[PDB]
């Protein structure tokens, strides 16, 4: 796959469409799109393990972590594959997401197709919060919206 | 992937949950679950190429057809990989789905993870309707509900 897409939905007002683009399989994945309905400021943004939305975002499981590492920010060597850090929403409640990551992929062992993108209630502390929770979820709080990441053209 | 799941939703009343299981990478896939909101009778049931629900079911594209064959029934040799035939809705508008298929897979190229499962308005003629449309879509008509197929626990 060179392209994937995800429609984020939730219980509240948060919704958006996120694109993924991977020009070649050994390469960075570009992640971009708009999420609306977000409170101004930082929001945890992660690929979770399962593409299961039968119980809404809850059934997506934990951060996609095939290497069994601790939670970090996207720039850390120590991080979950699904750790994409934060996205920032402006004063009109919009996050114009623009991220490039070389750890996630659209194929192979780190492939994120069929898993769930989740945007969170609060800022991801990027594993720096000094508690156990920080090393697991970054303390990003509730799952506001999510969707299954699908193959696109 | 040994397990997958799909939540079907549409613009109308049609909704359901379909599970997939594949014990061995070269074995058949079990497909089961339930869909409600369906008029009594036969309804086309296919995996469509793209897991793109930005336009709802419309953006999923045509039947998943990596081998460029003509539309057929699940037990034909000449079929699209995504061709899973008909589900049957009972008098109470519920289809109980129980299928086993040897052509789709949850890994490799015929992999349906991250593609879209669609339930159609009409009966799939399994490609024997004797017109062009039959060899493409089986004349199953509109897309009543769909979801992206995701990796499950
Ligand atoms: Cu998350
Ligand atoms: Cu179809
Ligand atoms: Zn994490
Ligand atoms: Zn077909």
UniProtKB/Swiss-Prot annotation, chains A, B:
Subcellular location as annotated: Cytoplasm; Nucleus
UniProt entry tagged with the keyword Lipoprotein: yes
Binding positions for Zn(2+) per the UniProt entry: 63, 71, 80, 83
UniProt-listed InterPro entries: SOD-like_Cu/Zn_dom_sf (IPR036423), SOD_Cu/Zn_/chaperone (IPR024134), SOD_Cu/Zn_BS (IPR018152), SOD_Cu_Zn_dom (IPR001424)
N6-succinyllysine: residues carrying this PTM: 3, 9, 91, 122, 136
Keywords: Acetylation, Amyotrophic lateral sclerosis, Antioxidant, Copper, Cytoplasm, Disease variant, Disulfide bond, Lipoprotein, Metal-binding, Neurodegeneration, Nucleus, Oxidoreductase, Palmitate, Phosphoprotein, Ubl conjugation, Zinc
Co-factor remark: Binds 1 copper ion per subunit.
GO cellular component: axon cytoplasm; cytoplasm; cytoplasmic vesicle; cytosol; dendrite cytoplasm; dense core granule; extracellular exosome; extracellular region
Keyword Metal-binding tagged: yes
Result for mutant: residue 57 to A: Exhibits very slow copper acquisition
Pfam family, one: Sod_Cu
Residue positions where N6-acetyllysine is found in the record: 122, 136
Entry-annotated residues carrying Phosphoserine: 98, 102, 105, 107
Cross-link 1-(tryptophan-3-yl)-tryptophan (Trp-Trp) (interchain with W-33), where in sequence: 32
UniProt-annotated binding residues for Cu cation: 46, 48, 63, 120
PROSITE patterns the record matches: SOD_CU_ZN_1 (PS00087), SOD_CU_ZN_2 (PS00332)
Effect of residue 80 to R: In ALS1; sporadic form; interferes with zinc binding
UniProt effect for mutating residue 146 to A: Exhibits very slow copper acquisition
Residue stretches spanning the membrane: none
MF GO annotations: copper ion binding; identical protein binding; protein homodimerization activity; protein phosphatase 2B binding; protein-folding chaperone binding; small GTPase binding; superoxide dismutase activity; zinc ion binding
Membership in a protein family: Belongs to the Cu-Zn superoxide dismutase family.
Note: The protein (both wild-type and ALS1 variants) has a tendency to form fibrillar aggregates in the absence of the intramolecular disulfide bond or of bound zinc ions. These aggregates may have cytotoxic effects. Zinc binding promotes dimerization and stabilizes the native form.
Pathology noted in the entry: Amyotrophic lateral sclerosis 1: A neurodegenerative disorder affecting upper motor neurons in the brain and lower motor neurons in the brain stem and spinal cord, resulting in fatal paralysis. Sensory abnormalities are absent. The pathologic hallmarks of the disease include pallor of the corticospinal tract due to loss of motor neurons, presence of ubiquitin-positive inclusions within surviving motor neurons, and deposition of pathologic aggregates. The etiology of amyotrophic lateral sclerosis is likely to be multifactorial, involving both genetic and environmental factors. Spastic tetraplegia and axial hypotonia, progressive: An autosomal recessive, neurologic disorder characterized by loss of motor abilities in the first year of life, after which severe, progressive spastic tetraparesis develops. Affected individuals have severe axial hypotonia, hyperekplexia, hypertonia, and myokymia, reflecting upper motor neuron involvement. Cognitive development may be affected.
Assembly and binders: Homodimer; non-disulfide-linked. Homodimerization may take place via the ditryptophan cross-link at Trp-32. Heterodimer with SOD1. The heterodimer CCS:SOD1 interacts with SLC31A1; this heterotrimer is Cu(1+)-mediated and its maintenance is regulated through SOD1 activation. Interacts with DAOA; the interaction is direct.
Name of this protein: Superoxide dismutase [Cu-Zn]
Organism: Homo sapiens (Human)
Top-level taxonomy: Eukaryota, Metazoa, Chordata, Craniata, Vertebrata
